[PDB]
Each structure stands twice: as C-alpha cells, then as structure tokens.
Amino acid sequence: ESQLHSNKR
Amino acid sequence: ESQLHSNKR
Numbered sequence: 001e002s003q004l005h006s007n008k009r
Numbered sequence: 010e011s012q013l014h015s016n017k018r
Contacts, residue, residue, distance in 0.1 A: 004013070
C-alpha cells in the first residue's frame with residue numbers, strides 16, 4: 001500500500 | 010478508487 005499511497009492522486 | 014478502498018483491511 002506504500003506504492004499506492006505513493007501514487008496518492 | 011472505490012474499487013480499491015473496497016480492500017480497506
């Protein structure tokens with residue numbers, strides 16, 4: 001989820 | 010995003 005919440009927007 | 014927030018944990 002790291003990656004995803006790095007994606008963020 | 011719904012489709013992934015769907016995965017919440």
